[PDB]
Each structure stands twice: as C-alpha cells, then as structure tokens.
Amino acid sequence: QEESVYALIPQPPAMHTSKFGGKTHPAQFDFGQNKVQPHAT
Amino acid sequence: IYKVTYEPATSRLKEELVQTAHNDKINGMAFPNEYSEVFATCGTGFIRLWHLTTCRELLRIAVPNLECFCIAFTTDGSAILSGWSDGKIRAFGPQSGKIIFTINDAHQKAVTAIASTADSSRILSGGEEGMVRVWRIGRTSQTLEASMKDHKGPVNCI
Amino acid sequence: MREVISIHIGQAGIQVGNACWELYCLEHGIQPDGQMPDDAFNTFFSETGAGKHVPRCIFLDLEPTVVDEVRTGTYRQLFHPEQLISGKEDAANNFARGHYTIGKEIVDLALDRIRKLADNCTGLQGFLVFNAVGGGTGSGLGSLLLERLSVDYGKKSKLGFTVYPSPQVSTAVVEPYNSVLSTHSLLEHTDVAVMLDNEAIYDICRRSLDIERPTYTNLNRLIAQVISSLTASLRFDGALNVDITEFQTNLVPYPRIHFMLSSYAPIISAEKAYHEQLSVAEITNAAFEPASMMVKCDPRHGKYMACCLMYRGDVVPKDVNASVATIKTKRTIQFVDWCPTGFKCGINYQPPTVVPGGDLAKVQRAVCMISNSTAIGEIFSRLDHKFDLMYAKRAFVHWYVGEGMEEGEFSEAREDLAALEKDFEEVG
Amino acid sequence: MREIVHIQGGQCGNQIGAKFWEVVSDEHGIDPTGTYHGDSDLQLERINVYFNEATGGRYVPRAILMDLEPGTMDSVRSGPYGQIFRPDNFVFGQTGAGNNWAKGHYTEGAELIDSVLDVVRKEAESCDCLQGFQVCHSLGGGTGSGMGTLLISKIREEYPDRMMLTFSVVPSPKVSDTVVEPYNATLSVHQLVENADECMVLDNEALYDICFRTLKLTTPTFGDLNHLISAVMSGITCCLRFPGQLNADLRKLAVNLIPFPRLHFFMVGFTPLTSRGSQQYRALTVPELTQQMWDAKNMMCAADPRHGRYLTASALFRGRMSTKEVDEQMLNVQNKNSSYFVEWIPNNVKSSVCDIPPKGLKMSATFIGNSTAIQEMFKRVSEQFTAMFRRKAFLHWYTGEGMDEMEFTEAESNMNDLVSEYQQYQDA
Numbered sequence A: 001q002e003e004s005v006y007a008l009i010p011q012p013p014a015m016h017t018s019k020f021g022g023k024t025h026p027a028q029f030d031f032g033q034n035k036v037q038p039h040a041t
Numbered sequence B: 001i002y003k004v005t006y007e008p009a010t011s012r013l014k015e016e017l018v019q020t021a022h023n024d025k026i027n028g029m030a031f032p033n034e035y036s037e038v039f040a041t042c043g044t045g046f047i048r049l050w051h052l053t054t055c056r057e058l059l060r061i062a063v064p065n066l067e068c069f070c071i072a073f074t075t076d077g078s079a080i081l082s083g084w085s086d087g088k089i090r091a092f093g094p095q096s097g098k099i100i101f102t103i104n105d106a107h108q109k110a111v112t113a114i115a116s117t118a119d120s121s122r123i124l125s126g127g128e129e130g131m132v133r134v135w136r137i138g139r140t141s142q143t144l145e146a147s148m149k150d151h152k153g154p155v156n157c158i
Numbered sequence C: 001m002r003e004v005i006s007i008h009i010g011q012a013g014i015q016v017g018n019a020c021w022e023l024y025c026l027e028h029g030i031q032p033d034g035q036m037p038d039d040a041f042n043t044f045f046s047e048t049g050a051g052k053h054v055p056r057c058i059f060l061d062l063e064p065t066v067v068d069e070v071r072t073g074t075y076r077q078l079f080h081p082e083q084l085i086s087g088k089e090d091a092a093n094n095f096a097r098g099h100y101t102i103g104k105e106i107v108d109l110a111l112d113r114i115r116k117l118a119d120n121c122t123g124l125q126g127f128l129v130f131n132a133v134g135g136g137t138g139s140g141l142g143s144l145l146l147e148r149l150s151v152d153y154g155k156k157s158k159l160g161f162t163v164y165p166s167p168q169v170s171t172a173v174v175e176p177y178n179s180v181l182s183t184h185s186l187l188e189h190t191d192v193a194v195m196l197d198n199e200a201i202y203d204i205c206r207r208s209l210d211i212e213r214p215t216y217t218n219l220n221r222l223i224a225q226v227i228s229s230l231t232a233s234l235r236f237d238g239a240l241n242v243d244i245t246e247f248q249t250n251l252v253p254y255p256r257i258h259f260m261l262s263s264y265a266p267i268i269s270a271e272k273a274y275h276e277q278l279s280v281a282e283i284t285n286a287a288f289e290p291a292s293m294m295v296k297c298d299p300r301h302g303k304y305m306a307c308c309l310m311y312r313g314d315v316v317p318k319d320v321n322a323s324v325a326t327i328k329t330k331r332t333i334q335f336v337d338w339c340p341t342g343f344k345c346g347i348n349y350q351p352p353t354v355v356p357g358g359d360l361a362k363v364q365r366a367v368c369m370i371s372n373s374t375a376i377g378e379i380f381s382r383l384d385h386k387f388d389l390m391y392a393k394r395a396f397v398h399w400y401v402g403e404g405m406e407e408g409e410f411s412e413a414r415e416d417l418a419a420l421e422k423d424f425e426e427v428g
Numbered sequence D: 001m002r003e004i005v006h007i008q009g010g011q012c013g014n015q016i017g018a019k020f021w022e023v024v025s026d027e028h029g030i031d032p033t034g035t036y037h038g039d040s041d042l043q044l045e046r047i048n049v050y051f052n053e054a055t056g057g058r059y060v061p062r063a064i065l066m067d068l069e070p071g072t073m074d075s076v077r078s079g080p081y082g083q084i085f086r087p088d089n090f091v092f093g094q095t096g097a098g099n100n101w102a103k104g105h106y107t108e109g110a111e112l113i114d115s116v117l118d119v120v121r122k123e124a125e126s127c128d129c130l131q132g133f134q135v136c137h138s139l140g141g142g143t144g145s146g147m148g149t150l151l152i153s154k155i156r157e158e159y160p161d162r163m164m165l166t167f168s169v170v171p172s173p174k175v176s177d178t179v180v181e182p183y184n185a186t187l188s189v190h191q192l193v194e195n196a197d198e199c200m201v202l203d204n205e206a207l208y209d210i211c212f213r214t215l216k217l218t219t220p221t222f223g224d225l226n227h228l229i230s231a232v233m234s235g236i237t238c239c240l241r242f243p244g245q246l247n248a249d250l251r252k253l254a255v256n257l258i259p260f261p262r263l264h265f266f267m268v269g270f271t272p273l274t275s276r277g278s279q280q281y282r283a284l285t286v287p288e289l290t291q292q293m294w295d296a297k298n299m300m301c302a303a304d305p306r307h308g309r310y311l312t313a314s315a316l317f318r319g320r321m322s323t324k325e326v327d328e329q330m331l332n333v334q335n336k337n338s339s340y341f342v343e344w345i346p347n348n349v350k351s352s353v354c355d356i357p358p359k360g361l362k363m364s365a366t367f368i369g370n371s372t373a374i375q376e377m378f379k380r381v382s383e384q385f386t387a388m389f390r391r392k393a394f395l396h397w398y399t400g401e402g403m404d405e406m407e408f409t410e411a412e413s414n415m416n417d418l419v420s421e422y423q424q425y426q427d428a
C-alpha cells in the first residue's frame, strides 16, 4: 500500500572433536581387570 | 487452464491451475523504473502483474465494470496510476492494498494517457475529449489545479 | 530464614534421600517420629503448631516399589504423606517416556507441592536437585521438572547433584542416549551442576575405607557427608560463614561452565585413625589428590579455574591460608592464568557427625573440596563416543520415536555437546 | 498396581503352568486352599500381581487355562494345587486339534475366541494398572501353537500399549517330538515375529543336559523340567514383586535388550544348579553365579552362543549381596573374552538385584541372552520345512482346513529374512 513496488517482490559446520577424546580401555582404571583377550572366560 | 485430476477409486477430484492468460484487448504496458524483471498489464477488466523469467502472474487488482487505460508507474519506484473509462484516475500500490486516491472527473470521459513528473510531484492526464490536465500531488494531500490545457483531439500519448 | 528445598528424582535420587535424611535427623537430635527431646534445623525442617519437625523435601518417582519402603520404614511418621510422590507405571529407562508421555501427567501435582512448600518459606536460598542421569525417570522427569522450575522462579538458584554414567561401570545399555538428552535441558536450567560417578566412589571404598563388599547404601553414606559439609554454614556457626550466592559467584566464571568436581577428606577406616594425626596440612594435600575425586576425571590433564574448600571442626584460619599457599607453588596443580586467586575457603566449628553403623571415623578435621576445572572435558567426550558409536546404526531408536519423540532430538542434543566441549577449549 | 495376566495354551502350557503356579504360590506362602499362611509382610505387599482377593481370605490366580481336549486339564484340576483356580477360567473345546496348526488356528480355535476374550477382559479390567500379558506355548503341537497365536493377534490389537511375553518351547534338533513339527513351527514363527514384544525360546534337549550334566539327575521327569522353567518365570518378576536396590520392571528389560524390532528371540539360563553331592564342595559367591550363568551349558536352548555374538544380555540376581561385585564381574567378562560381544555397543549387559532370594536359598540369579546364534534354531527348522514342503507331504491335512499355500511360503520368506538380520549384525 505504501507505493513500494520495489518492495513488492522480495529478491534477496563440523561439530568438533575434543583432544581428550578416546575409547575407554581396560587400563588406567583401578576398578577393573587390566587385560583384553579373545575367548578367555 | 486447469488440470483436474480425478480418481474414481476414492471419488476424489482435485484441480490445479496450470496457466493463466489475460482476457481480451490488453490496453497498457508498464515497467517499473530501473526494473527489468517485473511488468504490469492494464486490460479491459482489471490490472494484472507479471514478471520476466516466467509468466507466473503476481496479482490481479480487479475493478468490476469499467475498463482501465494507460497504466503508469510513478517515477523512481512508487504507486501505480490507472485512468479508467469513467473519467477518473485511481492510485494503487505494490500489494496495492486500498486505493491511494481517486481523482474523479479527471476528464470529461475516458482519460486516455497518463504521465508523471520525474519528481513524482505532478501527474498529467490527457483525456479522450481533447483535453490535457495536470494534478499536483503532495504526500497525503492531493491538489486539484486548473491547468485545463486544451488540445485538438484525443490524447494518444503523453 | 536460611532454608533450602531438597528435591529427589528417580531411584538414586531417593536412594540418596535415605542417606541425607538419616543424617539431618541424627545431626539435630530429630527422632524418627518428627519431634526432638532455632535455625539449627530451620534450614531443613518446619516446626508445626506443636512439637513436630517435618522436613522440607520431596521424594518423586514413578515406581511405588521404593517410595512405599519409605512408607513402611522407620521414617514414616516423619514425612508429610503428600511429599512422597509416586506413580503407577515407570519410565522404563527411556528418556521419552519420562519426558513426553508420563512426565507431563504428574508435574502438575509435584508443582503444587512446591508452591505449598515455598509459602511457609520466608527467605529461600535455593533448590537442591538430587538426580541420577541415565534413566528415564532421572533424565526425563528431571529435565521436564527443571524447565518448570526456571519459568516459575528463575531468580532462585538450582544446584544439580547428578550421578553421571561412569566409563566402566554401566548398569544399562541405552544410558548413553538419555544421558545426552539431559544436557540440553539441564544446562540452560541449572545454576550449577556437581558431578560424581558410581565408579570413582567405588575405588574410594577400596583404598581408603578398605570395605570389600561395597553397596549403594555405602556410597550414599558418603554423599550425605558432602551436603552436610556443604551446608554447614547455613545452620552452624563458624568463621567465614559461606552462603550459597557467595559460593556460586566466585566459582562459575562463565554462564556455560558450571560442571565441577568434588572430593572429601579424610576418608579413613575407624582404625587407621590410630595411625595418623590428619592435620589441616595433611588433609588439603589429599583433597587435591586425583585418587580422592568422586568422578573418574584426571585433573592433571587440565587446569583449575577455581576451587572452594569447606573445612570443618577444630580448624583455625591461620593454617588454612598456609596450606593453600603451599599448593599454588606445587608444580602438578596448574591454574589457568586468568585467575591468580581461585580459593573461596569456609570454616565451621561443628565437626562432621558420624552415624552409628557407618564406615567413616569420628574425626575433628574434615575437608570437602569442589573445583571447577577444564579437565572435565574428558568424561564429557567419552559420551560423545559411545553415543556416536551406537547412533550410527539407529539402535534402540524405535523405542524413543514410538513415545512422542523424533529424530531431530538426537542430532540436536548431540551438537550441544560439541558446542560445550569447545567452551572447555576456548579457555586455554 | 502393575498387575499381570497369564495364559497357558496347549498341553505343554497346561502343564508348565501347573508347576509355575505351584512355585509362585509357595514363594508367597499361600496354601493349596488359597489362604495366605506366610510370615512376613513382604509377601502381601505385591501379592496382587498374580492373584485376586476373595471372600474368606482366598487368593485365586490370574491365570487362564485354554485347551482343546480338556483331558489334560482334568489332571491339573485334580492335582494338589488344582483347587485354587477359578472354574470359569477353564475354557475348553470338546474336540481335538490333532497336532494340526491349521484347525488349531482356523476351524476350532476360531470357535473359542468369542468366549476366551470374555475371559481375558473380565480379569484385564480388574487390574487397576495392567503391566502386560505372558503366555506359555509349545511350537510343536496344534493347540498350543495354533490357538496361542490366534489368541495373540486378538490381544495385540485390543491391548497394543501393554506388552505380551512368550515362553515358547520350540522343537528339539536331534529328535522329533512330532512328525509335522516343522509346519507348525514356521506357521507359528510367522505369527511371533509380528505379534510379540519379547519371546524366550526353550528346548527339551537342553533341558536334559542341565539335568544330565549339571544336576546329575537319574530319572528326569517333566515334573522336574517344569520345576526348571518355573524357576526362570519366577526369576523375571522378582523385581515386580520384591524390592531391591536396583529394580528392573518388565518393560525396561526389553528396551535394554532388543535393538531392532524383529530380534525379540532370547535365550535363558538359571544359577545356581548343583548336584545333591556337589553342594558340599562348591561355594555360593557372586563369582560363581556369574561364571555358570555365562557358560555355554546353562543356556536352556539348544543353540551354542559361541557360534555368534552377544548383542545384549541381562542378569537378575537375588539375595542381599554387594552391588559392586556384580558390576565388576559382568564388566570383567565383556573385556575378557572380547570376541563374542559386538563392538558398536560399548556396554551390553543390564544388571538387577533383589533383597529377596528364592524361598530356600541365599543367592541366585537368572540370565537372558540375545545372541546372534539364535539363527541356528531357524536354519535347522528352515531346512526340515523345505525338505517336505518341496514334495507336498502331509499337506492335505493343512489344505483340508481351507488354508492356502502362500501362507507357507510367506512363513518361509519371513524366516529366511530373520536368518539374515542375525548376520548383518554378526560381523563375526
């Protein structure tokens, strides 16, 4: 309504990976055993 | 032109509008200043707006009975002026909303040519009964001055 | 006037509620039948019109099978029968059920309690959220509840004591997922969040306590010893009485970093006290020892942004400032450069109380340390691995999507973790 | 709250249910008259999960005995614990099923559902909060398999929220209990893949080794095997009936176990099982329960788990014990023999505990395994089916009931896909 025929038609990332990151291995942990074997038990 | 797809399986009938076209005797063309992508067509029933790359008409501002003549864009990018067979000029906008103003009895009958100043401060109207006039236009107040430029016949162009 | 609201959510929520509330009833001579034979108890209780001292807490859960034990245990004359909220069907270790299906139909009840639990409250310090992340009720209800608490009070402070999934010990398989979903809802809503893992507290019971058959009832008898030490200033006289707002101002540098560690010392058997003196000097060296952490994080891989030390018992400030001074010099402990300070210290003259049948020893000096460190990114990146290892196959998803959830809520709650770990690296 | 309704289909079901309701009854200290004669208040608090109060202090089970040829019902209607059942819960047909899956599912079964459903709803609505259904089948014969599945498809739609269990006894590999066994097997499997939340599989073969190897029995009668199956069906709902420091509802046992909606076949065991001579030597410690349950001998199904990988697993310990020894043991195995556990699931065991062991023991357990060796039951069945459907043997009995033949092939494609689902997820 405002005589704006120019305004009539409008014409116009990887997350990251931490350094600490790592899978827990059965070492550096005093709660459990300290080996990994195929079919021991 | 409609594409009516009907399936009797569920008895469902849906229509689509493929293409539209003007009715008859497109009177006037208009380009918005410094714009080569959209244009406007004044016809014998109402004003339609189209664009360049595709037909895909944008809107149809309707006036029921009397026909439009010599559609015009106010300079520098502004309202659309349209003089009708009534002898009256009317202004619309981009979405064109509601009539910006109606200069009524702008001529005796059937105003035929319409032009604007480069400053969008006055509007020329050449009528079919061989007369030329100009109206001064403020921002929200219109000025009806009495130029009365007499010409020898219908004003085809201004 | 110096009062807090103690919420317990889930099973481990009320599992620690039985340890904490067995402490305050004993620490103030409050018999299990309410009455005892001011402001020493007004932090946790509310004297009625005659004699009775009801607590100000709320036990919330979905399985009655535990909340009814409180109804039949010796602490049944204690609680207002409406505080012990319970449900009919449970969350079934499914974050969606605890958030979308079942959570929405009892929060309207729980909230009415809080409104009727805060009117008698004249000056409220802050809410106290005992939560167990890893279950539907712990993660779902907790998340849905916290958002409701933010929009009601906002200005009040929420403290989050959330048990976190340990690296090795895991009593579930899908506990990676609902532990991730909890972050997006706790982070913006808790004012500060303490963490502790069921695994780290196990080894504490091995070296120090020398107890070889540990059980959940043992560990909870340690957490209660933290909050008792944490809120001693609220209810017991002492040099440098430390409120909550003070505690919170000088510990959280940025609105994001509010995930902190805990410790306690001394933790010893009732017989090795005969082989030690446990001076203020000796304890504070053990609070900063990595094996005395209650979480399986290694502070030697990171840096300290602040620490807070709440001492208790026969302790005078001349020895606090001395033992703290010989720590800033120690090479192992690295403090991030933009804080040359970093210690808010608190002293009390009320030594830690001991419960009959407990494992700790009667001592006259005790320390509880709560540090905000940048090494906390470790335990937070393991989750970013197990979640990305199982979610690669959409395993167990059809349970979450079937309970009024979607697939976006997984990737959304995943980026929030990356958005967080950068914040633990921008501070380098 | 949290009630359970129980179905017994077929001759086998009407006989396992005899021992099941004998075992559970004693555990809750109720007489074959139905009067409670126990000692503790622990029996009464969760008695309504299986029974209903009645005038005179009786407790009548919530079972439904359905069978054609009521002859076998006349046995249990006459046994020692036969006086407890409601007589209106006995629904039976005057004719026979003939070990024919068709007429047990199409002609005769279709004549009883109109009455059976009035039975199941009459006692499904008396439940203030229904938890789920549980059935006991036999995939060899006609009544158990045929009517069982037809009962399920009616149940699956009427109650889709609740959960249906299935202790289906499947055929034996080395000996054939019937001749038309493979036809009844697949045609029933094709119903279980779509209309069952969980489904345990058992085998009379493996039920013989445990009595021939472990129990070292001499004359193992079905009266003893059913005392084995009843020991696991009682071992599942302990957390529903008895409190424990880590409870496990029936629903949270599936979401932690079934990654994809079609791998709902499991594998069970029980511990401890010793001779009457060896009970003098072997001790009862969590390290003992944990190795015998994990072994490849107590698997009550005839499928060696050492031919595939464990997707997930479970364990329902019973008896006041140390919750740490349980957690470190089940962990110790996964990383010990890491070749039988999948890698895209970091921790794939759930662990429950109960303060209440069996009636005559101090420690006990119960195992549930979801292994990719369960496909071996399907191969051995998929071949015996295609050896005789290839020549159209014994089919005039199945087509004589108006059956099609694509219902046979659809039963084979559905199976021969289920045998591949168990192989993508088994990368060896």
Ligand SMILES: Nc1nc2c(ncn2[C@@H]2O[C@H](COP(=O)(O)OP(=O)(O)OP(=O)(O)O)[C@@H](O)[C@H]2O)c(=O)[nH]1
Pocket (backbone or CB within 6 Å): C009, C010, C011, C012, C013, C015, C016, C062, C063, C090, C091, C092, C093, C094, C132, C133, C134, C135, C136, C137, C138, C139, C163, C170, C171, C172, C198, C216, C217, C219, C220, D245, D246, D252
């Ligand atoms: N320190 C401690 N941790 C516990 C205790 N009980 C359970 N946990 C841990 O809490 C986690 C599961 O939380 P729960 O509260 O049992 O589950 P939930 O939040 O109620 O959700 P649902 O199981 O679906 O009802 C597990 O990892 C437990 O190791 C306890 O008594 N003390």
Ligand SMILES: Nc1nc2c(ncn2[C@@H]2O[C@H](COP(=O)(O)OP(=O)(O)O)[C@@H](O)[C@H]2O)c(=O)[nH]1
Pocket (backbone or CB within 6 Å): D009, D010, D011, D012, D013, D015, D016, D097, D099, D138, D140, D141, D142, D143, D144, D145, D169, D171, D177, D178, D204, D222, D223, D225, D226, D229
């Ligand atoms: N554990 C156990 N299994 C049985 C017993 N009796 C039969 N079964 C099995 O049930 C199978 C036959 O199915 P059956 O129940 O007799 O036919 P139905 O009446 O149509 O269901 C056979 O494989 C039997 O071995 C029993 O007493 N104890």
Ligand SMILES: [Mg+2]
Pocket (backbone or CB within 6 Å): C010, C011, C093, C135, C136, C137, C138
């Ligand atoms: Mg729980």
